[PDB]
Amino acid sequence: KNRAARVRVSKGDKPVTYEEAHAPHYIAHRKGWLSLHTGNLDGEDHAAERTVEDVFLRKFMWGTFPGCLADQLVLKRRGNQLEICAVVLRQLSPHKYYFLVGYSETLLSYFYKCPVRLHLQTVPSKVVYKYL
Amino acid sequence: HYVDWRMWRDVKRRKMAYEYADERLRINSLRKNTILPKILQDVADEEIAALPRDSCPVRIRNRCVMTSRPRGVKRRWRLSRIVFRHLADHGQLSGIQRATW
Amino acid sequence: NHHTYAELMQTLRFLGLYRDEHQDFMDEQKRLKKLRGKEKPKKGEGKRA
Amino acid sequence: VNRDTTAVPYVFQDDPYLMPASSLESRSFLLAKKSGENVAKFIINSYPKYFQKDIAEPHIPCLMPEYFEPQIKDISEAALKERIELRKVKASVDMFDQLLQAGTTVSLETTNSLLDLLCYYGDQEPSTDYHQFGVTWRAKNNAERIFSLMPEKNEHSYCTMIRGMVKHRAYEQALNLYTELLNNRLHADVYTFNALIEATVCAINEKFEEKWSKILELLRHMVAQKVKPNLQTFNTILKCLRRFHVFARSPALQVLREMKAIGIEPSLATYHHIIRLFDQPGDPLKRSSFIIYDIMNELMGKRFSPKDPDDDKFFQSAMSICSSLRDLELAYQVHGLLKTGDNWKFIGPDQHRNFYYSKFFDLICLMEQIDVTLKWYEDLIPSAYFPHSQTMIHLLQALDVANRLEVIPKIWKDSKEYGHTFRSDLREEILMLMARDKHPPELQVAFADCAADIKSAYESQPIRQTAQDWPATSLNCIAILFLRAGRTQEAWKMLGLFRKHNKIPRSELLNELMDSAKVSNSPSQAIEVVELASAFSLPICEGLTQRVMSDFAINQEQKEALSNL
Amino acid sequence: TYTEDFIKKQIEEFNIGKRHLANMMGEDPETFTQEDIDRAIAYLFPSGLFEKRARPVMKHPEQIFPRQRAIQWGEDGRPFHYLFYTGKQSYYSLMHDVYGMLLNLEKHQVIGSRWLIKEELEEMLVEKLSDLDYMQFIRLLEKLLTSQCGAAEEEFVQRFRRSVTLESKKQLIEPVQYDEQGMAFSKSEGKRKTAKAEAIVYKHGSGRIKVNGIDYQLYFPITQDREQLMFPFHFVDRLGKHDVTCTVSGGGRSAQAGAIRLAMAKALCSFVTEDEVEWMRQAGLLTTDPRVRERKKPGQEGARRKFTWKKR
Amino acid sequence: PRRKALPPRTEKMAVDQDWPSVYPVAAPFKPSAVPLPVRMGYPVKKGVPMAKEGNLELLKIPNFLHLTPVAIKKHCEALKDFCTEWPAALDSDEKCEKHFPIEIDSTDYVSSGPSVRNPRARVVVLRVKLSSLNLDDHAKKKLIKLVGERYCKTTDVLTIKTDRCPLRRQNYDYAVYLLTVLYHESWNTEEWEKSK
Amino acid sequence: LGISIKVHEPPRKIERFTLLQSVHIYKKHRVQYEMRTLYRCLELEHLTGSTADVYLEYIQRNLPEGVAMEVTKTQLEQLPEHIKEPIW
Amino acid sequence: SFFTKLTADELWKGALAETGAGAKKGRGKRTKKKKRKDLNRGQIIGEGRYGFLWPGLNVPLMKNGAVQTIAQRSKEEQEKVEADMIQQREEWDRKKKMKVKRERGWSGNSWGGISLGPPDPGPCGETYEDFDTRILEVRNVFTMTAKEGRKKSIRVLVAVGNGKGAAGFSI
RNA sequence: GACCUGGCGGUGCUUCAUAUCCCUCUAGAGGAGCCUGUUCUGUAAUCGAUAAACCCCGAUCAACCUCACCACCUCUUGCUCAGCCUAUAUACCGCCAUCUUCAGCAAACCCUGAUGAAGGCUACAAAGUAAGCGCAAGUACCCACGUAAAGACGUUAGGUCAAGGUGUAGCCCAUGAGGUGGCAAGAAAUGGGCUACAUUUUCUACCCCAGAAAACUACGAUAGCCCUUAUGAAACUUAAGGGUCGAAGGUGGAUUUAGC
RNA sequence: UUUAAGAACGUGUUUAUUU
Ligand SMILES: [K+]
Ligand SMILES: [K+]
Ligand SMILES: [K+]
Ligand SMILES: [Mg+2]
Ligand SMILES: [Mg+2]
Ligand SMILES: [Mg+2]
Ligand SMILES: [Mg+2]
Ligand SMILES: [Mg+2]
Ligand SMILES: [Mg+2]
Ligand SMILES: [Mg+2]
Ligand SMILES: [Mg+2]
Ligand SMILES: [Mg+2]
Ligand SMILES: [Mg+2]
Ligand SMILES: [Mg+2]
Ligand SMILES: [Mg+2]
Ligand SMILES: [Mg+2]
Ligand SMILES: [Mg+2]
Ligand SMILES: [Mg+2]
Ligand SMILES: [Mg+2]
Ligand SMILES: [Mg+2]
Ligand SMILES: [Mg+2]
Ligand SMILES: [Mg+2]
Ligand SMILES: [Mg+2]
Ligand SMILES: [Mg+2]
């Protein structure tokens, strides 16, 4: 049987998100892409460096906002800029969110040598597409 | 903090081959011709063969940058077939989708 | 450069700014093996001689 | 594009949960975002090696670690200059002795560069990421020690030493050091003379007539040494004259006229020191009115550039003058001057911005028509400043004046969205206005739907230190607003809270309770009205009870009513 | 579940958002139809997802949310319909009405139309139906038609019939054109495999054909290929009456002929009668051949062949 | 108690407002800012598409909310002061090649990332017809033999492509220099040419 | 801005490649992927250095995510001085 | 390396082996089962080994009306925080180990005689607080299936009563 | 002793299989040579897959490197707040094979069997109602066709601890690390494939109206031997080309594969 | 009523405001 990126069915008590409920054969039919850049276009270059940056960013933000991310990130590149768009929860205090936005935006700008901006969208609880 | 020693040995190899790249280049130019005397070409055959082994570029291996896998690596992303699919199947690679036709 | 990535996030973890769920895993297991007696021996002064 | 009125300042996260509601959040949210940038710079400059790799093309110098530590470890003339460029007071001075002890010739342009570093910070280290009252200057300091060691002293030597003393409130010592300058056949610069004017007045608290003569001497010396004054030279004069509010009024204009004579354009700070001086806590304010009107005509239709550090403090004061004068046609010129070109940047920091828009908006509601006052409330708030509890009050006192009490149910919603949900003074002025007079059903039902929200705030209070307290007027108004609306059921449940908290009910609340009972024709309820007022021993109750007994009362209840008194 | 009050609040957000969307695009909120909303949502929120049901959509709540049955009992608890306890009050109230009209008839005494499909009947009745239930209802309707149904009965039966758009398998004639000299001709196109051909057929000629500027017998040495070129004209008895000038590109030897055969036939339909064009169609001269090379699969030697299988 | 989220500011917005002021530049989709009941997602059995609140699919879209027609027309109205007028004389292309017989081609590449470099940006191509040059029978015959496959007899165009040097200003100079030594050597006649 | 523009859609390009489905053995079973590259060419005409400097900056800045650009600029020049007449 | 590190849900899902071939047909003894532990329970955002105090995250932003600055706990004070974190851990853990003396029925390991409490309330405002439930028999019965084989199912017998003549049983 | 469920039956009846069971069509395999894998043997000298569901399989790839093997030598807080290709795939995640060239899995309620394991249909209707998963529907390629993709719950403790990660256990002057050099062969058997045994052929021109060749100088090696070149620091060894050589083979046993 | 057709080692697969 096929297993990649499939959430196995259960009794019906397991909540899943939209992206987590669709398998790889829906990536351009019912889903989009979580990262958007020009590396993988015909005749373009540096698709390997943009991928290592993505893998590190998804882990930096998972451990920098522990237990706060409601759904996967969305990385966006427009030339030199790097836009991180995240959906987070409302448990943490806003005082601490503003601290981490400025700490991460700055730390990552000096690491990757590019202007970095972070966009949060708070939701009360993790959105549920269906129950498996 | 690399994946394994096999990876660490290739990092060193890529570093030593970058230092002697020009020195090796200049010597081979003498050997790769029919113009200069054989006596001189014979001396350059011994000078480049006395260089350290790790300076030779053919001893470099394109491993995966995440798992250190020597085979099954896609050169454009520098990843193994197993890691590439893990990222492509989750929609983390821009433009990469499954083919059907 | 894996040194930078691993040394950076090792430092950020001691600073309290990065939470590595993977180290916490193996740090908790390595703590339960000391209570069970499976502790790493002293170098040089090992079981063999 | 233009400012978005529905939004908060760009710097904040455009998200309902992260938006600053109150004015305290607005300032505490940017201090935390500034604190994360500082925590990251600490980590970037403490572990440079992780961030040295540069992949950017073209190179970005502003995104690379800074190196604050000295690299030339040898003892030489060039090794000390590198420790003076990093502002290393302790290392440079402790290393200057070693260089001096060795006997190596030290250039005069190098020893003068050390005095500037010492005369500015006062032999103290600058502030770093991590390691008011009184006179900062000290006698036991290196500034005076090294000054004696020097074998040769030029003009700059004294010039930079006199300015370091005045900066640290060493006025008395600076004047003593200036006497030596004149003894050495030397000439000071404009900057040194500027600090000398501050020492004259601040040294002694004498009468103005003596001070004015003193100042004119330095000016006559400035022209006697071929020294030309600058804008700062004139600004200090006005800033110093502030103490003598009344007397300095006329001298001030002479200083202003003088600036115009030499073709020195007064900046925003110059006009700031004038209005503060002329402004005085007086009722007539005849002179203050005439001054400001002339200044605006001069400033009208101009674009300003930064010249003096206090140029920003102009707008905050000018608005205060218009508020004290209660002149709105003048405030439109002061604010209309703040929008031209790029003068909007001179408004100043937050605290100056919050105060500016308070005096400004509070004067709008009071003076202009209500239809225009509400267009300014949609533009400024919240995009410009977060209001204070007082502004909401003044705005409420304008709706009363315009007989537009149908907007009150909206001003209470916005107050809670700005952090005024638990402001006692505010809730005590919104209820009285709604219950002051009877209104049509449609309008009387809205005030109750808002009075039910004001009532819930009293029930849930953030401060649990003290017991829940309900103001007398509040309970008096919350209950009467249920009756007029039609919520009789809820109107009788508030009766227990009156005596529970020993709060006196007004007669108008009791007199109107009659109809509610009469419409119901339930004598039992009618007695409850009598029983409550009797507990408080109100005189209206006894006379009221007789009328109720005439209209509706059970025989058994009539006898009990008299005995209860 | 979605209540009636909830739907009513969604109707008010669409109306307001419909006025904002026109303010963005600079249109008139009054004359802003649903076609303009779909075009403006596709510019602002561009999605190329192959599934159109997964793209951003801003429609009317009456087209998004599924239709739901109204409440069937009041406060007291009595249902509103006498066939409630059947569970199919709508389906059986229909069967009761139809069977009542069949009793009255006994007492006093299609090409475009298609019977309502099952899935379309549930929407009308707002009820879940089985297959065998659908057939029973269809049997009464047909039985109703056979009898001399009255005018009022026909209107009822026409609520359960749906029109059908009957396509026409009639070739489309090309417009005859005129050149500078004044000769009449007609142009068409053919396609076989990867070969694509454009043919120009003159009304009057001496049976000359030129492919890419070369006479046909030189361009097609193989006899089979020339037989294909002759088939269109021989079938209609017009050999040696027209002059053809075509240009074929791509494909191989035999694919270019079939591509040319098709174009010549399509362009030859303008100089013949309708009955002949129909005959050309029934002979396979106007149909594009869809048989194209099939792709090879991984784990296989070819499109359909498999690797040699070893049982042990 | 717990901190509650404020209502979205879409409610305070009016219909006859100025949208460019809300979304002046490119920014992600903010449901608390966009006053539209837009939905996205594949619906479940007897369900409706997911709403904008919390939707990640709308965050993946590179929206064009900052580029409404109203803004474009308003943006370009402010950019007409930077532009210059095209010579009315040079109406067609035949008249452009009569006064400007040389055409320089150069390509620039825009790609995401911190580095803007691209080795394909150094290439420079120079095309010019030989009918616009002051050549005679001999010079023209000799010039066509030196350039080789750079000259197309069908169009009578000389094509010079330079990608030797790092920068694009150097390759431009190299191409002009190549065109110059070709023109002059073509005019020069040597003795060996007699043995044709 | 008063510029002539023509638009055409060049044919797309699809680059495919196959990979093994399993981590070990099971050669027969593989997974196929593709990257689809779609094009759109905008042919402008009769511009000046300043007009192009503005228009390009305007559209380059608003270039969306995942969209590249290849700008081919065709400049008009005049014959150099040395080319006017021969020296020999 | 930093790129070869997974998440907790992936680390625990593999270590517990809850879903495996051993779990399906009674191929694993339940005497020593591995128990999941949440490692983020008692972790605070901003706390590290070095003892740094980041204003806004670890400690209050302003102190005495003034914004704090970056400070680091002393060795003596930072060591007192690590030992105090341990006590909260062991205590928290201890509670779980502590076992309640559940009232046994006819026997220690038997199910008969054990009470289940009052039945669940009905939707239309029906409650059975006056009723008491008690188990009579718990049997493990099987049926053979084509794909899985032995299919284990539970058969339970209970009784309910109010103490006033009303009683009933079910399966 | 009597039953429930399932499985099995060289168990009955009936209807069917569509490249599938039989008959029937087309080209092949099994014979020879070569390439390549595996098994045995051999060697101081890896591991893994290994009925269907292994055998040009992990490898879209091994002259050193890769490399984990062998011999010899060398280092010890060691590139890592160490390390281990050490044992365990019968502890696991992860990614998969297989039935699947299937259509069923099943929560939650009701009812039958005297309230047993269990079972639950008849349409002119006799107790079943059913979320959800899958199928289907949709989408991709040139459509409505077809091909892909998809394909649940489970079955084979099926494959993989040597992708990486990891539980348990074990090593820590060595089961770790590094260097130099070296083995990867063939008595033998076998799987898969390539080229051939020729005349619908061979050579040349041409890319389909030609001329020659045609049985011991024919057809026929991508083999051997020699030489040269390409890559590389390194090639009797890898590849390409030339020369030389002109072998088996004369359409292939039982049996056997694929294809609408 | 209708040819023949053998065999498959032993265990283990379910609970608790400037000033
Ligand atoms: K054969
Ligand atoms: K064979
Ligand atoms: K074979
Ligand atoms: Mg498969
Ligand atoms: Mg290699
Ligand atoms: Mg084939
Ligand atoms: Mg016991
Ligand atoms: Mg082997
Ligand atoms: Mg084995
Ligand atoms: Mg095995
Ligand atoms: Mg195979
Ligand atoms: Mg080797
Ligand atoms: Mg070796
Ligand atoms: Mg080892
Ligand atoms: Mg074993
Ligand atoms: Mg297994
Ligand atoms: Mg398939
Ligand atoms: Mg399907
Ligand atoms: Mg096994
Ligand atoms: Mg021969
Ligand atoms: Mg040969
Ligand atoms: Mg060589
Ligand atoms: Mg036997
Ligand atoms: Mg047996």
Side-chain angles (χ1 to χ4, degrees), chain D residues 1-2 4 6-7 14 16-19 21 25 55-58 382 417, chain F residues 3 5-7 9 12-13 20-22 24 30 32-33 114-117:
Chain D
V1 297
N2 279 307
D4 187 38
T6 56
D14 202 337
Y17 176 77
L18 298 166
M19 271 186 175
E25 285 185 353
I55 54 176
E57 285 285 342
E417 171 169 344
Chain F
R3 185 163 191 281
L6 292 170
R9 60 178 176 106
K12 304 164 55 184
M13 297 186 182
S21 305
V22 180
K30 291 166 288 182
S32 63
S115 190
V116 66
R117 298 289 178 265

Side-chain angles (χ1 to χ4, degrees), chain E residues 85-153:
Chain E
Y85 287 105
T86 63
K88 295 178 179 179
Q89 63 181 21
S90 296
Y91 171 77
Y92 287 129
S93 186
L94 189 59
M95 295 292 287
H96 177 91
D97 293 1
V98 173
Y99 178 94
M101 290 186 298
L102 292 179
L103 296 180
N104 300 330
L105 304 182
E106 303 172 14
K107 285 183 171 186
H108 61 77
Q109 304 176 24
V110 169
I111 294 169
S113 295
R114 66 159 183 70
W115 281 131
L116 204 69
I117 58 173
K118 182 176 172 299
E119 288 188 331
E120 193 168 352
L121 177 63
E122 294 177 350
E123 293 176 350
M124 292 176 70
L125 297 174
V126 196
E127 285 301 321
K128 182 179 178 181
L129 296 176
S130 178
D131 286 341
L132 278 177
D133 286 303
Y134 168 82
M135 304 185 191
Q136 296 268 358
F137 170 75
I138 293 303
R139 279 188 280 274
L140 288 188
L141 289 185
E142 293 175 348
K143 186 177 162 195
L144 193 54
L145 295 175
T146 59
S147 64
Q148 176 173 1
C149 56
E153 289 68 10

Side-chain angles (χ1 to χ4, degrees), chain D residues 127-140:
Chain D
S127 296
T128 59
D129 289 346
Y130 182 57
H131 161 68
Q132 311 183 42
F133 191 58
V135 176
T136 298
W137 198 260
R138 296 161 314 279
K140 302 185 169 187

Side-chain angles (χ1 to χ4, degrees), chain D residues 229-474:
Chain D
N230 57 352
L231 193 64
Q232 295 82 0
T233 299
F234 294 108
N235 290 337
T236 62
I237 293 177
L238 292 164
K239 194 172 184 171
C240 294
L241 283 184
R242 181 177 181 171
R243 295 181 183 174
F244 298 97
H245 279 296
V246 178
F247 309 100
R249 292 181 182 174
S250 177
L253 297 175
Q254 294 177 336
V255 177
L256 176 67
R257 297 180 191 97
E258 183 178 2
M259 296 172 63
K260 185 165 178 183
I262 299 168
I264 303 301
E265 294 178 350
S267 58
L268 289 180
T270 299
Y271 295 113
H272 167 227
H273 294 299
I274 294 169
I275 60 187
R276 292 295 192 183
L277 178 64
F278 280 99
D279 184 2
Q280 190 169 357
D283 288 359
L285 296 174
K286 292 206 167 190
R287 295 178 179 83
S288 303
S289 64
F290 299 161
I291 292 306
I292 190 66
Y293 295 143
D294 290 346
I295 296 168
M296 283 310 314
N297 296 3
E298 167 49 18
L299 296 174
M300 172 177 69
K302 277 190 189 180
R303 275 168 190 69
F304 305 110
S305 64
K307 288 169 190 157
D308 194 63
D310 290 344
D311 290 344
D312 57 330
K313 296 161 195 190
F314 171 80
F315 288 100
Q316 64 179 20
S317 304
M319 191 51 67
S320 174
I321 303 302
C322 307
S323 70
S324 300
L325 282 165
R326 289 180 47 171
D327 181 310
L328 185 64
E329 306 183 27
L330 179 65
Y332 285 143
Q333 299 184 22
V334 168
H335 182 70
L337 170 64
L338 176 76
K339 316 305 299 177
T340 66
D342 291 346
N343 289 337
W344 65 265
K345 291 195 271 170
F346 289 102
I347 194 170
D350 184 1
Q351 61 179 18
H352 297 356
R353 171 165 64 271
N354 291 336
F355 176 80
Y356 169 90
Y357 282 112
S358 296
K359 296 299 161 195
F360 178 53
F361 180 66
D362 294 5
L363 169 72
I364 282 170
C365 296
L366 177 62
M367 298 285 299
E368 76 166 2
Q369 187 174 356
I370 194 69
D371 301 292
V372 189
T373 292
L374 289 161
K375 282 177 192 159
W376 277 107
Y377 169 77
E378 181 192 9
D379 289 343
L380 306 183
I381 300 161
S383 49
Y385 82 128
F386 285 97
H388 185 237
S389 64
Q390 289 308 317
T391 71
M392 296 281 89
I393 289 170
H394 294 83
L395 171 56
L396 286 159
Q397 292 169 8
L399 301 180
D400 183 2
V401 167
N403 290 336
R404 286 204 51 174
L405 295 176
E406 70 281 5
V407 176
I408 304 300
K410 182 185 166 296
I411 299 307
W412 169 247
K413 273 196 57 175
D414 292 352
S415 296
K416 301 195 312 168
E417 171 169 344
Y418 304 150
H420 301 300
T421 299
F422 308 109
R423 297 297 300 177
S424 50
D425 53 307
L426 184 60
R427 290 176 302 185
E428 290 171 24
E429 299 204 21
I430 289 183
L431 283 178
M432 306 186 69
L433 193 47
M434 291 192 289
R436 190 179 54 187
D437 313 311
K438 292 173 188 171
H439 297 293
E442 296 201 3
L443 176 57
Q444 191 58 59
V445 167
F447 295 164
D449 287 358
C450 182
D453 186 2
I454 290 178
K455 170 177 172 298
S456 178
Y458 281 109
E459 297 177 356
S460 300
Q461 188 174 356
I463 303 178
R464 281 187 164 183
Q465 299 184 17
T466 59
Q468 305 303 1
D469 184 1
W470 290 62
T473 300
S474 177

Side-chain angles (χ1 to χ4, degrees), chain F residues 144 150-157:
Chain F
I144 299 179
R150 295 177 183 86
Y151 172 83
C152 184
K153 182 176 182 176
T154 301
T155 66
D156 185 41
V157 171

Side-chain angles (χ1 to χ4, degrees), chain E residues 23-85:
Chain E
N23 177 50
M24 302 182 186
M25 308 300 290
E27 305 294 3
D28 188 14
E30 316 306 340
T31 66
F32 202 67
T33 56
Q34 182 67 28
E35 308 165 353
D36 304 356
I37 294 179
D38 293 349
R39 188 191 61 253
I41 292 298
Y43 169 79
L44 303 174
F45 308 97
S47 185
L49 301 183
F50 298 129
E51 303 276 1
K52 297 182 179 182
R53 281 187 290 183
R55 296 177 180 170
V57 66
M58 172 178 168
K59 291 171 177 174
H60 194 266
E62 303 290 11
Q63 302 177 349
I64 305 180
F65 299 80
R67 182 176 181 170
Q68 61 181 18
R69 60 177 183 183
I71 311 182
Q72 295 159 333
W73 57 81
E75 300 169 332
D76 54 12
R78 313 178 50 88
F80 300 146
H81 207 291
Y82 70 110
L83 299 174
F84 167 87
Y85 287 105

Side-chain angles (χ1 to χ4, degrees), chain F residues 41-42 83 109 131 133 136-137 168 178:
Chain F
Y42 195 85
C83 303
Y109 303 85
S131 58
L133 296 177
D136 61 8
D137 290 0
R168 172 172 42 186
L178 283 178

